[PDB]
Design a protein around this ligand. Structure first.
Ligand SMILES: OC[C@H]1O[C@](O)(CO)[C@@H](O)[C@@H]1O
Ligand SMILES: OC[C@H]1O[C@](O)(CO)[C@@H](O)[C@@H]1O
Ligand SMILES: OC[C@H]1O[C@](O)(CO)[C@@H](O)[C@@H]1O
Lengths: 445, 443, 443
């Protein structure tokens, strides 16, 4: 409470009719406001965890209520309506004369019109975190909330043309909200999908059509976990198998179901893995396996229990063995390796914000520290959590809590990073609070 | 003729009745899935049979595929939407007993979803009705239910603001990984056309009215979106080229955040003054400027493109004839992904090397769409020329599945011979030429 | 042991007698030519049998291959030299009757010539005699005639000033297009070794003296040429790097006109101070700086390299252990051809992608040569380590033909399992380790 960071977090709070309802993304005094003066649903999560652990839960309750109201608001682009269940990427408070009102971005204001797919999942997860932290079960059981959950599930569980139980998205549909070759079936979306289904199973009442929703949830839940665990898992044993796959196999009972051509498996993968390491791949689809390591997807896979115990140990072993690549001078690298040269051009459409080792394209993101700490505590690798926190702690305050860091090893402050980025401040606080009392990790697991 | 006899021998029979045609009758290559009837491949065969007058095979096909729609489809305990039509099917027997076996994507190479198959089914059902006058078929409760299941799948709520359909890579005629994921033109145009057909085929009875309302609504949004965002011409390119990056807000010009420095050099030089086309794809940070022939030709036929847009697409074909027709109509898409682009986008797919197969190969089947579109736009002479090019080679080459090279000079690297829709494509084109009124069945 | 039982089941029988061993016993892959006994592959099998004491199979092999040498070999009316030994052979039957069928290059993929096979035959005949003490075999007129035919082919006059042997690409263990055309080290070293063996095996009777004289003469010139022009160390690299281009005349330093700007960057950093090796190739305007393991190890064993050179090759292995042994001894050559170099040099050969198969793959069979060379140079501890690496994986992996990756971590992309010379290689290495005196049979 008396810390510098806590006071920065307090100033970030957004008020609405005299009540705290969220936090701004950043308080950078110089850069263009752009959309950084808005409360992003994904950014609020670590803020919420600080507030819940501290004991002031009104802000989180208020956030959940107002975002539920935003769900019923109308969204249009060229006058077409998406599903009613879509949660917004972000919102802020405006005022026309005397009265305050909330304005939101559901993707129709967003740069590149990216859909905030992860936002509705984070909302479910935060609702669950709220329940477990406070003990207040009544909020989620209110008819409003039940309906809101169900609208999210309608979109998530929408019928597919394909045989894949994964969720299909366009590029830039999560924390990585720009064109980064994370289209189709990105790990992060699948892991958050799995976690949200697990949560919905706790939150849903069987009343009315509730039993119908639970049925839909449980069927997808098992299929999704099987699919991810069996086809996304990468280790040396599995790589040896994939590398020897024959191409152009037709039929049900074939090994190479997705028609991966082993001559396309990148050079770096084979040398990068340690004997006792492993990870969930970045993406899988027709003719495609994305071997990039994505930190958020893997860490949440440990916390949500999607990964098995052994798989969770092997992910942490990878972090230990490739510490320079994945932590370096600032935890945690968002994905590894960076897209470079002509691959950057082709995959990102020459996006100047995502040059090699910058931002989404292999930058290091302080916020991810809270996930890493949680995961390290859960797998009983506390020493890793401690070293990671020590690294971040030695720079963040001095650098004024940047949004992200750049370079192979995170040496540079992010090229266009906002300073006083709220989830960089909150991430460090959450990590320290988890370390001080490891039982609080149960809020997210 | 030689072609008719070949088409006849391709017919699959089931309990004594014709129900479809095999993809190819190659004497030497591995069967793989080429001994099956593909829903997309059967379309031109069906047209031959409809115009000839033997319509039983088409009626039977429509009935058997409807039945297949209700088959149990599964991979590792997951079910797709109930409306999904198969990629293909064949007949198998246990002793005396015969039964149909289908690939819904669970057997398919790379597990690609046959998203186009359900749209082609609706279009063929409409073509059947218009051509025969048999209104009894589509009216049947089973057929009404079947159309609706497809609409349930096509119109299911999504996360994005736009009304286009989201698909994985390889979801249509291009059924391998080719960077046609997200919002490929072919899917959007087939979707539009299928919706227009559904509008005519749905009975109002019960919830039919609800379906018709949703269809009408989507048709409007879809036509607007496609025409206003996919259309490429010199004037539009000048606009896009001058777009500012990283615009945030509802009221911005560069909504999808295209960076003009990434616009390929070939595009600006390739378009003639009076030419234009619908782009291959659109999504976050992405515009695929490749020209896709099927999408563009079907846009003309379905009335998705305006009359002027249709004329400008045909102007493009005339001006860039060597590129898009060359020695074999029609080039499936232009230009080819080359070098490291081929590696990155296809995952080093050996069947789609540059200027081969899906990656800028030339496909004889497309001649029937080109001929239809040419007739509709009043470019009869282009139809004559394209038909003359194909007829000069196909028979001598034993009707290859596809041709390769910048200008289609090579027989396809792995092309099957006696590919059914290559034979049916030529026949259909000549039938249309003889009686242009038959173009109505697909327009 | 498991390995012995596997080696036994690989034996080919012919009219009731053992005459060779199949290349692999893969339960699943296409036979291709892996159901044949290769002359090069049989060598380590032969050594196992010689050291065990069952020498009939080796005697029978030598006899049957000699007979094959006299078989009619043809492609489009052209005959090679009469001394050519086959790449491989197998047994076939017409009803009850059995007969041998051989591949001399006329069946081979890419029509590659098995130049190494005839040299391996001579070396095995010498190994047989030394190990058994049966001097009656090589003395037979038929065997004398057979040795001479091989020498006629090896020593036939050529156009070049140097005494090395000119070959097309893919003429040895590396039997595919890998830029090992012209004067590859392996051929020159095997040639030298075969000549040394021929010196012991030839009777003086009749023209035997003439042959012995030519052999003696070539041995001298060949050893000088190889040692003085193929040897690479830091001191030599400093010389070559400072060579002037386009020197004309007898008395010039840069005889082969190597341009020092073309010397690859990796070479200078890779060599340790006390390390060195024989280069992979030499010819007009060309020095192939790739390290080739078989050539270098056989140079040690045949006494072609000096004692110091032998120690410096072993120093290279110790210093660059991860590169040359890694997780599976031994890397066939280093480094891999990559990117456009792979395309240009291999013609985009899919079996030889970077760090795979011939193109920098790791080959268990080579362990027997490495162990022999290590014993001979007094580096017993390196032998122990390499053997420990292989034994920790081969049985669990079902004895793959080869391993892939920079450090041999992958099982070979298209590796057959139960590859005979992988099994025989390990057994031979352990046999040598137990009794180093047996190294004499190949030295
Ligand atoms: O609206 C989407 C935009 O929002 C950001 O997260 C911050 O401005 C960008 O990464 C993205 O382009
Ligand atoms: O099952 C899908 C496969 O079917 C084909 O159309 C023909 O074999 C291929 O293009 C594709 O990979
Ligand atoms: O016939 C020559 C062929 O035999 C092989 O050794 C095994 O199939 C290949 O390396 C080569 O291409």
């Amino acid at each position: 409470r008396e810390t510098e960071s806590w006071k920065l977090l307090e100033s970030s709070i957004i008020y609405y009719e005299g009540n705290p309802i969220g936090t701004v993304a950043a308080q950078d005094p110089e850069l263009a406001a752009l959309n950084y003066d808005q409360c992003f649903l994904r950014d609020f999560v670590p803020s919420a965890f600080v507030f819940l652990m501290d004991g002031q839960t009104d802000i989180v309750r208020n956030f959940l209520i107002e975002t539920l109201t935003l769900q019923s608001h109308e969204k249009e682009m060229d006058c077409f309506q998406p599903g009613a269940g879509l949660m917004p990427a972000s919102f802020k408070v405006e005022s026309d004369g005397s009265k305050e009102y909330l304005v939101a971005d559901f993707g129709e204001k967003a740069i590149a019109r990216v859909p905030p797919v992860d936002s509705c999942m984070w909302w479910i997860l935060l609702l669950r975190a709220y329940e477990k932290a406070t003990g207040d079960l009544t909020l989620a059981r209110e008819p409003k909330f039940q309906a809101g959950i169900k609208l999210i599930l309608d979109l998530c569980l929408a019928h597919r043309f394909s045989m894949y139980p994964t969720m299909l998205v366009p590029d830039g549909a999560f924390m990585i909200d720009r064109r980064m070759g994370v289209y189709e079936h990105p790990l992060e979306i699948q892991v958050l999908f799995y976690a949200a289904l697990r949560a919905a199973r706790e939150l849903l009442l069987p009343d009315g059509d509730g039993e119908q929703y639970l049925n839909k949830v449980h069927g997808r839940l098992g299929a999704l976990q099987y699919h991810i665990r069996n086809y996304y898992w990468v280790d040396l044993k599995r790589l040896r198998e994939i590398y020897r796959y024959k191409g152009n196999e037709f039929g049900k009972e074939i090994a190479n179901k997705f028609n991966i051509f082993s001559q396309s498996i990148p050079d770096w993968v084979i040398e990068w893995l340690p004997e006792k390491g492993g990870y969930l791949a970045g993406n899988l689809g027709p003719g495609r396996m994305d071997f990039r390591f994505f930190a958020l997807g893997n860490l949440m896979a440990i916390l949500a229990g999607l990964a098995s115990e052994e798989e969770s140990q092997r992910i942490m072993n990878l972090f230990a063995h490739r510490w320079e690549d994945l932590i370096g001078y600032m935890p945690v690298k968002i994905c590894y390796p960076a897209l470079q040269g002509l691959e950057w051009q082709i995959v990102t459409g020459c996006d100047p914000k995502n040059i090699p080792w910058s931002y989404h394209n292999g930058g290091n993101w302080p916020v991810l520290l809270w996930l890493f700490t949680a995961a390290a505590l859960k797998t009983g690798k506390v020493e890793l959590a401690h070293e990671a926190i020590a690294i971040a702690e030695g720079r963040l305050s001095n650098d004024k809590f940047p949004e992200y860091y750049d370079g192979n090893n995170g040496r540079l402050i992010g090229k266009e990073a906002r300073i006083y980025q709220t989830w960089s401040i909150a991430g460090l606080l959450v990590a320290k609070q988890f370390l001080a009392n490891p039982d609080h990790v149960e809020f997210i697991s």
